[PDB]
Design a protein around this ligand. Structure first.
Ligand SMILES: [K+]
Ligand SMILES: [K+]
Ligand SMILES: [K+]
Ligand SMILES: [K+]
Ligand SMILES: [K+]
Ligand SMILES: [K+]
Ligand SMILES: [K+]
Ligand SMILES: [K+]
Ligand SMILES: [K+]
Ligand SMILES: [K+]
Ligand SMILES: [K+]
Ligand SMILES: [K+]
Ligand SMILES: [K+]
Ligand SMILES: [K+]
Ligand SMILES: [K+]
Ligand SMILES: [K+]
Ligand SMILES: [K+]
Ligand SMILES: [K+]
Ligand SMILES: [K+]
Ligand SMILES: [K+]
Ligand SMILES: [K+]
Ligand SMILES: [K+]
Ligand SMILES: [K+]
Ligand SMILES: [K+]
Ligand SMILES: [K+]
Ligand SMILES: [K+]
Ligand SMILES: [K+]
Ligand SMILES: [K+]
Ligand SMILES: [K+]
Ligand SMILES: [K+]
Ligand SMILES: [K+]
Ligand SMILES: [K+]
Ligand SMILES: [K+]
Ligand SMILES: [K+]
Ligand SMILES: [Mg+2]
Ligand SMILES: [Mg+2]
Ligand SMILES: [Mg+2]
Ligand SMILES: [Mg+2]
Ligand SMILES: [Mg+2]
Ligand SMILES: [Mg+2]
Ligand SMILES: [Mg+2]
Ligand SMILES: [Mg+2]
Ligand SMILES: [Mg+2]
Ligand SMILES: [Mg+2]
Ligand SMILES: [Mg+2]
Ligand SMILES: [Mg+2]
Ligand SMILES: [Mg+2]
Ligand SMILES: [Mg+2]
Ligand SMILES: [Mg+2]
Ligand SMILES: [Mg+2]
Ligand SMILES: [Mg+2]
Ligand SMILES: [Mg+2]
Ligand SMILES: [Mg+2]
Ligand SMILES: [Mg+2]
Ligand SMILES: [Mg+2]
Ligand SMILES: [Mg+2]
Ligand SMILES: [Mg+2]
Ligand SMILES: [Mg+2]
Ligand SMILES: [Mg+2]
Ligand SMILES: [Mg+2]
Ligand SMILES: [Mg+2]
Ligand SMILES: [Mg+2]
Ligand SMILES: [Mg+2]
Ligand SMILES: [Mg+2]
Ligand SMILES: [Mg+2]
Ligand SMILES: [Mg+2]
Ligand SMILES: [Mg+2]
Ligand SMILES: [Mg+2]
Ligand SMILES: [Mg+2]
Ligand SMILES: [Mg+2]
Ligand SMILES: [Mg+2]
Ligand SMILES: [Mg+2]
Ligand SMILES: [Mg+2]
Ligand SMILES: [Mg+2]
Ligand SMILES: [Mg+2]
Ligand SMILES: [Mg+2]
Ligand SMILES: [Mg+2]
Ligand SMILES: [Mg+2]
Ligand SMILES: [Mg+2]
Ligand SMILES: [Mg+2]
Ligand SMILES: [Mg+2]
Ligand SMILES: [Mg+2]
Ligand SMILES: [Mg+2]
Ligand SMILES: [Mg+2]
Ligand SMILES: [Mg+2]
Ligand SMILES: [Mg+2]
Ligand SMILES: [Mg+2]
Ligand SMILES: [Mg+2]
Ligand SMILES: [Mg+2]
Ligand SMILES: [Mg+2]
Ligand SMILES: [Mg+2]
Ligand SMILES: [Mg+2]
Ligand SMILES: [Mg+2]
Ligand SMILES: [Mg+2]
Ligand SMILES: [Mg+2]
Ligand SMILES: [Mg+2]
Ligand SMILES: [Mg+2]
Ligand SMILES: [Mg+2]
Ligand SMILES: [Mg+2]
Ligand SMILES: [Mg+2]
Ligand SMILES: [Mg+2]
Ligand SMILES: [Mg+2]
Ligand SMILES: [Mg+2]
Ligand SMILES: [Mg+2]
Length: 276
RNA sequence: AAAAUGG
RNA sequence: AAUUGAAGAGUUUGAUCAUGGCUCAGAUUGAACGCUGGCGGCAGGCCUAACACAUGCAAGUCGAACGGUAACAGGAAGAAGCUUGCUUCUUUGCUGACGAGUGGCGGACGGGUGAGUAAUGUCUGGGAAACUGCCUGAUGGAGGGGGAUAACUACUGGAAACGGUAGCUAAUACCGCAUAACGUCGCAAGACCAAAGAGGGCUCUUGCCAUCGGAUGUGCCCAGAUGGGAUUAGCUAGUAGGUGGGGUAACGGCUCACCUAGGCGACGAUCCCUAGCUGGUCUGAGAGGAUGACCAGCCACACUGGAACUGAGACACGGUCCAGACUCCUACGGGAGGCAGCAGUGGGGAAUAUUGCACAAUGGGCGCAAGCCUGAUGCAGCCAUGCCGCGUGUAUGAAGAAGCCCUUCGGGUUGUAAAGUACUUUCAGCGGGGAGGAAGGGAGUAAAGUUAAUACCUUUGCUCAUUGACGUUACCCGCAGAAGAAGCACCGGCUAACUCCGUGCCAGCAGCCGCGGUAAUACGGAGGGUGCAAGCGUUAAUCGGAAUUACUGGGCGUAAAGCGCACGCAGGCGGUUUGUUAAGUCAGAUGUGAAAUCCCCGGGCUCAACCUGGGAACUGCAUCUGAUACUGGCAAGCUUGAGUCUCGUAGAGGGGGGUAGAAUUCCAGGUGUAGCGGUGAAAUGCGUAGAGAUCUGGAGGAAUACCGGUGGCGAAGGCGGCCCCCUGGACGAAGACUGACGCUCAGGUGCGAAAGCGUGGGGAGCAAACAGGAUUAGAUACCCUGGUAGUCCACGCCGUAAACGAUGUCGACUUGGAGGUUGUGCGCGUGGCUUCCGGAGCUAACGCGUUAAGUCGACCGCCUGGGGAGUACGGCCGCAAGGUUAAAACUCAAAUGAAUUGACGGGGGCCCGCACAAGCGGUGGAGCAUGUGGUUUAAUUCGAUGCAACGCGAAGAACCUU
RNA sequence: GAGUCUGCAACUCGACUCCAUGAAGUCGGAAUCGCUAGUAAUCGUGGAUCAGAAUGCCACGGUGAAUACGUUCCCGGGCCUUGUACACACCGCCCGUCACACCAUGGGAGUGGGUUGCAAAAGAAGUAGGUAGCUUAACCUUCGGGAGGGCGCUUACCACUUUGUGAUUCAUGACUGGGGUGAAGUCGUAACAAGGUAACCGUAGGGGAACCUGCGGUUGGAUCA
RNA sequence: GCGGGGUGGAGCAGCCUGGUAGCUCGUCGGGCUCAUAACCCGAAGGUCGUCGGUUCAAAUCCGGCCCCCGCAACCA
RNA sequence: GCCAGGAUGUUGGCUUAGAAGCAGCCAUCAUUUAAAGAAAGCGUAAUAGCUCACUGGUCGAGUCGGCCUGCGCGGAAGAUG
RNA sequence: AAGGUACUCCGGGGAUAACAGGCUGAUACCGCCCAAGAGUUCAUAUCGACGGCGGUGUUUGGCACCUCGAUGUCGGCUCAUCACAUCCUGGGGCUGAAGUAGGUCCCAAGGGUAUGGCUGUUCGCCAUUUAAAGUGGUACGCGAGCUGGGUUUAGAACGUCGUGAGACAGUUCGGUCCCUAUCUGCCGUGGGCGCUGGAGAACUGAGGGGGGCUGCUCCUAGUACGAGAGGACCGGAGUGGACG
């Protein structure tokens, strides 16, 4: 970490030395990601750090930011009552959690009937859910693609507090996760690979090996272009492979697409990792 | 006799 | 004439007064940053890395010291193509000159930096033991010789740097000899010591040597002053002194030997941390506080550590030697170098300039002079960095235009603002004139002086050409045309300056108080305004406001602050009288206190900034001459303060020993019979193994009813039956005696409740701990039944309490009243002590009030917002418990005192109500009506919700109503 | 089951009648309400609303009690006084442990630096002293030498450097102590009223915590009719 | 290997000796209070680990199967 | 053994990014024939391509694979020789 | 009518345990058969479910045959010797083998095959090497060769159990290792006789023993191969480690 501060300075200098060098700390992962136009390029930079900058470093695969979503729908109740004398803290909310349309995120519905939960406490309930959803409901990753319907609740004239209702809301989400079976999501990436038709088969074979799907192929100029969607984690190291397959005559451009459920095996591994 | 508390 | 000088505000509360912190308005800067940007003058400009430095430059000069001649520019001579009379080519230091060398002088100045340094520094004032190139005064001398040596030559070693060997040579280079005295040595007699020539035409000029002066510079000494820390109190063996010897220009432990045992320090030594000092600068009414950039003086340092050499002067920025780290060269053997001179580069940093020009002037080195050298200096460049002056137009202009903003849509505001019209043109721009900084120096020419000389030289006049980096100088003049020239911050209060719109505890703002949750003068934008202006804001920084460290000029009953009390050393302070001294003090004088700056009066730049003449001031210090009241010293006194003695009085004053009565407990026995004991109510407990109760005898410990008291005694803490023994203090009466013998007191020392600790005793009662029983949601409590340490004694330790009057001690003074207690004189006096109340005065108020918290004086202790914290760490003390001394970071905008109006109280008093009591009839249970909640529903419309919603809005939903 | 009436229309969803049927209920847990006389209690009657639709509301008469000793207690209100740390005013204020996060700081086996004391070692260059040897322009000379000097060597002083052992200062250290700041956490309620056991001071013992208990002290406690 | 357990939500009875589910707390409804706690009144909730066997009948007895404890697990 | 042919509606359809005999899933055909699978393989992203089955020619006598049984073979690595 | 004895003692047993041997082979280890699958496709490059068949003697065991008128037992040291189920070096097939480097299987036993830290350790983990740090058998090779740390006498203590004496597949500190080699074997070294008359030399070679390891650099050649990164075979030369 003494060389970490030096690493910052080293990366700054390296960026000045080479425009193609791009240093960027991924906020979600909290890991600095070094971008290069080639493996050898990055290698030389790292070697330079070790010597010129005198910064000992070890390269690694960028961590992937995953998300969670309830795979099942279940109505749940969250009750929080803490009254032992004087001003207490009562709050009960019955919230129905249902898998939302992928990408629709959170679609909270206030279906409170009979004004069981007073209007003033309603926003707190929702806000409390949102905060709890941001926290991991399965492994620790932000819960997305879920719909919470507060159909029923309970309140006390004195004990009930907005914060109590936020607590009750969070409690509901917890028990919902136990019944709604959240699943980990992985960020899919749309990759556009262009190469001579001679290597087309090999490229598509690589994508399938990664786990990605070939969207389709299309003729451009002289080099065929294959559209595909590959997981970010799997996409790592594609550059070298592409050049190897195409004899350094292949180019690819990857962009984020959506979040797909991590393979049950992979999901299990992620949960294990997050657990410890 | 007992007789706490009240973001 | 040298003065003219002094503002507050916001924020603790429901409100108030006080206390107290925080914040703000001002001024200032080597500034930085952001935004903006016409011009000029003057000035300033690496605060950081005493970090590392590429390149050039910053110290040379002299041929009137000398051998020479490397050049070159000539001359003469001789050869030459032979301009047939010049040219060429050679020779000749031959001359003008001059490379290199010897020599002399300078290089110790000038320029840079502030690392080190808390005094071998600086500043002020004194002093004896010195030295001093160049300059200047006076008096003498200046004779006659010698031996070298560079350059040079040959040779030779090295990559280079740098050399080696042999030969030759000069001097104002070097050494004898003579000379030797207002010199040195010595008591004296005696003895001893120097020199250089050069230049012009015998003379003049310059230089040389000896001595004594002058000036100047420099060295040295002493006293006072010059940061912080005691959570640094001891320090020191050349150490302190002496003596002798040596050493220095000189005094000196400067050095050495020997001898003695000193020296320094609470008036701060030693050690630690920080730091160049000063004249000055900034702030301040001042006193202070802060600071030491530029300018001037002084000191210190020059890659780091160290040393000497030369010299008048250095332990030497651009010298030497050694070591070290760096950089560079190398043939690997060895070499070379030092920007804290100027400019400049890299690095560091928020941030600080051009590898300019000229020696025209001033000043310096060398020279006879001419001249040469000078990054000193004079100037130019960049930079709004500051200061100062000026400009960006000026009059007219209602059309009160458009257009913007706002509006009650009437209008208002921008705003005479703009258009429009009439003028002016600073400055910029273009053109053309034009100072002054310039003195001198160089030619002649003249007279005089000098001399043998109308020579040469010197002096003063005279005459003729001639010297400006800045520079396109200032300044003046002319020409075209308002043309080419305004921005920045702010408008909730403080604080001068308000609306609209957008946003909606979000975004945001903010020095403080706070502002923002849908009518934001507080955010953001717009319109309008306010303040400043080529600047305006922000940040950092200092002082002020802050009387908030209070010398001037504050506090301590309750706000922070009186040591628990006392004794007492050092220290501070001290009644009254005479004489004496003159230390302080006061007066006058004299020397000094650099210049600059500041101040006053002036002068000069068109003004101002800026520059300059004179004065004032420098508040201080030394010395001399005076004054003598007060303070001090000395001497003699006096009695009034203080003290002693004679006599008597009161007292729970202390220490020791003895004794009495009451009660509790226990033990033994008698009588007697079922309870006792305890509580709010109980229970545990005790009792038929005879309790409790009652009576008798005995044992032991502790404390002394009543008297008894706003009583008494004691420094305080404390002290209570009676008796004796030992002992301290206080007070009164009337005399005598002493003669200021006093007061306070850092440090120090002693005393010091209760609890606690050590050792050895004692132990009735009481009772931390502990146990059980209750109480309670729980009850580690309060209550009950038991019960150990301890409480008691001896000796030792601890050293603290709301150790309180939350009020230090001593002295004097300033209306009264009612009491207590204890003397004393003759009902009326007069002392000591004490309680309550109260006047003036004082106090924020409460209160204090002759026992002051009034009015003053002496000395001491202590305080400087609330927390953190009387804590940590260190020291000291302790057996331990702990005590004592005593921080910081961090955090908050308060904390606090007294009093006021409420409210409230399981505070008090006085009243009252179907409040309770005394009664009567009900509700809660059933069925049903009705309202409500909830749940259900396509919808079950909406509102009402503790008392004070729920047969409520609804005094009447089949449709309508709805 | 059979009707009546009002009304466009009585299924949802009217009142009423007739016949039949004949539920719970045998006096109401804890708790709780009204009423002091023409009152309660009970008995009928009328009215508004309104087509129709009262056990409600509003109003009218009939009959018609019991009990009040009193202020000990409960609750509320008024007035006077007193304490107060309360002021959207006791539904006030407010203390500490514990949980979590963050910040500064103390201790800590130690670890790495700076500075420095003491005791030694060391000895470049230079300067001074001595002189194994070597060498020598100027002076002297008996002409051989001599005087004197230089070099070398040696000694003293001393920089770099080295070693041991302390002191001090700074940084860092598993873990740990207390402090502060958070946020509607948990546990109680210690203080402020006599705060419900007056509080507080010193000391000692005990206890999850605020604290409790003993001993002595202070008033900076209320109360007193 | 030898023993003891597995019963309303929690901790405990009942088993021995078949018929014949208790106690305290918690929970729920009503009350008290401004409200909460405390307090008062009323009520619900184990078919007895998991099956099999026996018996007219099984928490009870027998035997597995799982669970959770205790003890033993040695000497060359 | 060898020389040939080895197909046509038709890439059967669906699905498949693509899937044409040869990913998978449904089919499962018909046609010209001597005969030629809605394909037994290799192959391709899919294609294509290379076979094969099937069949015709050539060749001129046996040929092919099960059953029962005799005897052998592999499976079969160790420490003094 | 219960216990302790490690303070112990006597008579007996290999009728009966602990050690080593034996028998056995459950277990262990090694190999094979079938092939569901995995491997983009594709059982068999590599791997392999559900099941099946063997081999070794190799762990943990079973049995109690040898030894109780005694067969010393963990680990280390010294010294070895064999097997091959091969760790390195040699040869080869396949590969999901571009090269380099691997994977897997076959052949091969000539030689070679760490030092330290910690622990009694074997082992293991760790540090740093190496071409490699092989796996087993040999009374878990080797105490009439050494050690004596472990373990199992008598002393003592802790935890624990027990009323206690004492005890523990707990721990802790301390605590006597004898033997002059007759025979076999082995390393050396002589005497006798023989080999056909005696004697002095020089030999032939049946037979036996020893030895046999390997790194790195350079060249080939930055050549083949690879888009690059990298980087050879084959062949040649030099210089080391260990050992003799
Ligand atoms: K104030
Ligand atoms: K300095
Ligand atoms: K000295
Ligand atoms: K002396
Ligand atoms: K000053
Ligand atoms: K120095
Ligand atoms: K000189
Ligand atoms: K000049
Ligand atoms: K004062
Ligand atoms: K004194
Ligand atoms: K006097
Ligand atoms: K006792
Ligand atoms: K005092
Ligand atoms: K503070
Ligand atoms: K009822
Ligand atoms: K109806
Ligand atoms: K009606
Ligand atoms: K009151
Ligand atoms: K800490
Ligand atoms: K430390
Ligand atoms: K209390
Ligand atoms: K106490
Ligand atoms: K026995
Ligand atoms: K096999
Ligand atoms: K395959
Ligand atoms: K045996
Ligand atoms: K192979
Ligand atoms: K081998
Ligand atoms: K072996
Ligand atoms: K054995
Ligand atoms: K052994
Ligand atoms: K043996
Ligand atoms: K032996
Ligand atoms: K034998
Ligand atoms: Mg010259
Ligand atoms: Mg001379
Ligand atoms: Mg002489
Ligand atoms: Mg300094
Ligand atoms: Mg002032
Ligand atoms: Mg000298
Ligand atoms: Mg110099
Ligand atoms: Mg220099
Ligand atoms: Mg410079
Ligand atoms: Mg920088
Ligand atoms: Mg020059
Ligand atoms: Mg205003
Ligand atoms: Mg608004
Ligand atoms: Mg300021
Ligand atoms: Mg002040
Ligand atoms: Mg004050
Ligand atoms: Mg106070
Ligand atoms: Mg106070
Ligand atoms: Mg006092
Ligand atoms: Mg005193
Ligand atoms: Mg005087
Ligand atoms: Mg002056
Ligand atoms: Mg006097
Ligand atoms: Mg007496
Ligand atoms: Mg008294
Ligand atoms: Mg005591
Ligand atoms: Mg005692
Ligand atoms: Mg008692
Ligand atoms: Mg008691
Ligand atoms: Mg005190
Ligand atoms: Mg007292
Ligand atoms: Mg006090
Ligand atoms: Mg009074
Ligand atoms: Mg303390
Ligand atoms: Mg202390
Ligand atoms: Mg009812
Ligand atoms: Mg009503
Ligand atoms: Mg309707
Ligand atoms: Mg009244
Ligand atoms: Mg620390
Ligand atoms: Mg030396
Ligand atoms: Mg309390
Ligand atoms: Mg109390
Ligand atoms: Mg109190
Ligand atoms: Mg207690
Ligand atoms: Mg066979
Ligand atoms: Mg064999
Ligand atoms: Mg034993
Ligand atoms: Mg025996
Ligand atoms: Mg046997
Ligand atoms: Mg036998
Ligand atoms: Mg055996
Ligand atoms: Mg045997
Ligand atoms: Mg298997
Ligand atoms: Mg066996
Ligand atoms: Mg047998
Ligand atoms: Mg035998
Ligand atoms: Mg093999
Ligand atoms: Mg072998
Ligand atoms: Mg072999
Ligand atoms: Mg061989
Ligand atoms: Mg090892
Ligand atoms: Mg063995
Ligand atoms: Mg072995
Ligand atoms: Mg032996
Ligand atoms: Mg043996
Ligand atoms: Mg042993
Ligand atoms: Mg052989
Ligand atoms: Mg061999
Ligand atoms: Mg060898």
């Amino acid at each position: 970490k003494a060389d970490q501060d030096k690493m910052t300075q080293a990366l700054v200098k390296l960026q000045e030395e080479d425009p193609t060098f791009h240093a960027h700390t991924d906020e979600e992962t909290g890991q600095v990601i070094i971008g290069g136009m080639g493996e050898l390029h990055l290698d030389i930079l790292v070697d330079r750090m070790k010597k010129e900058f005198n910064v000992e470093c070890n390269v690694g695969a960028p961590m992937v930011s995953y998300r969670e979503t309830f795979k099942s729908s279940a109505q749940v109740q969250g009750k929080f009552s803490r009254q032992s004398g004087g001003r207490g803290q009562y709050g009960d909310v019955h919230i129905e959690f249902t898998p939302n349309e992928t990408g629709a995120g959170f679609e909270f519905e206030n279906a409170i009937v009979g004004g069981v939960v007073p209007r003033e406490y309603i926003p707190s309930v929702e806000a409390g859910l949102k905060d709890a959803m941001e926290n991991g409901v399965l492994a620790g990753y932000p819960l997305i693609d879920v719909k919470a319907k507060l159909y029923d609740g309970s309140y006390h004239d004195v004990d009930s507090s907005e914060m109590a209702f936020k607590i009750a809301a969070s409690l509901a989400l917890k028990e919902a996760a136990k019944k709604c079976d959240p699943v980990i999501l992985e960020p899919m990436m749309k990759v556009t690979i262009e190469m001579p038709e001679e290597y087309m088969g090999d490229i598509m074979g690589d994508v399938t090996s990664r786990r990605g799907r070939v969207d389709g192929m299309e003729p451009r100029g002289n080099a065929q272009v294959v559209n595909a969607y590959v997981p970010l984690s799997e996409m790592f190291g594609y550059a070298t492979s592409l050049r190897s397959n195409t004899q350094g005559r292949g180019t690819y451009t990857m962009y984020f697409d959506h979040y797909a459920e991590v393979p049950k095996s992979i999901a299990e591994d992620i949960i294990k990792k997050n657990k410890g």
